[PDB]
Amino acid sequence: KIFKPEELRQALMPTLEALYRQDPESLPFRQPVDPQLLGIPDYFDIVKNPMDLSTIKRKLDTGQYQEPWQYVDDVWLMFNNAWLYNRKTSRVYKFCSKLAEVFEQEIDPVMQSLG
Ligand SMILES: Cn1cc(-c2cc3c(cc2C(F)F)N(c2ccc4sc(=O)n(C)c4c2)CCC3)cn1
Numbered sequence: 001k002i003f004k005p006e007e008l009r010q011a012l013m014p015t016l017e018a019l020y021r022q023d024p025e026s027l028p029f030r031q032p033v034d035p036q037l038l039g040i041p042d043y044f045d046i047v048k049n050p051m052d053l054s055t056i057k058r059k060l061d062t063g064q065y066q067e068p069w070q071y072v073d074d075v076w077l078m079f080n081n082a083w084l085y086n087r088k089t090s091r092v093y094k095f096c097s098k099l100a101e102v103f104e105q106e107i108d109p110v111m112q113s114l115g
Contacts (some may be wrong), residue, residue, distance in 0.1 A: 001115060003066060003067060003068065003114070005063040007114075008060070008065055008066075008068060008071070009060055009061070010067060010079050011068070011113060011114055012060060012065075012071050012110065013060060014106070014110075015103065015106040015107050015110055016053065016056060016057060016060065016075075018102055018103070018106045019075075019099050019102060019103060020053060021056065022051060022095075022098060022099060022102060024091075024095065025093075025095035025096075025099055026053065026094045027095070028060050028082070028091070028095055028096075029052050029053050029078060029082075029095075029096075030052065030053050030054060031052055031053075032048055032050055032052050032054065032055065033047070033052065043085060044083060044109065046085050047081045047085050048050040049077060049081070049085065050081065051074050051078040051081060052078060053078070055074070056071065056074050057076065059071075060083040068110075068111060068114050072107060072111075075103055075107075078096075079096050079099065079100050079103075082095075082096035083096060083097075092109070098104060
């Protein structure tokens with residue numbers, strides 16, 4: 001199966017929008033982590049492949065996904081980075097877990113629809 005750019009965008013953008021609609025839980029994930037500004041300069045020692053919502057949105061808007069699983073992989077890279085870097089008691093970790101619950105719920109019927 002070949003997926004057209006607008007087909008991926010129409011099917012997947014609502015799932016991304018469901019993540020942005022979570023407050024406060026989307027807030028840590030809206031822009032790329034800036035370790036110096038945020039006071040966490042060890043971040044890139046630990047997270048080798050950063051990912052965030054703004055990057056995923058741009059990739060969806062600019063045809064950088066050819067297959068829905070490439071989009072799913074980037075969302076999960078964002079989640080796995082947050083569970084790797086952050087302590088289990090932290091806001092970012094718990095907010096990541098909430099986003100992963102929302103995403104699992106939204107993405108399943110969409111994958112079924114895409115075939
Ligand atoms: C009202 N409210 C605001 C926040 C919030 C907002 C941002 C961060 C973190 C938090 C909070 F949850 F701490 N920001 C952040 C800081 C440290 C790390 S470490 C990591 O992996 N990430 C993704 C981040 C992100 C990025 C800038 C926005 C949560 N509620």
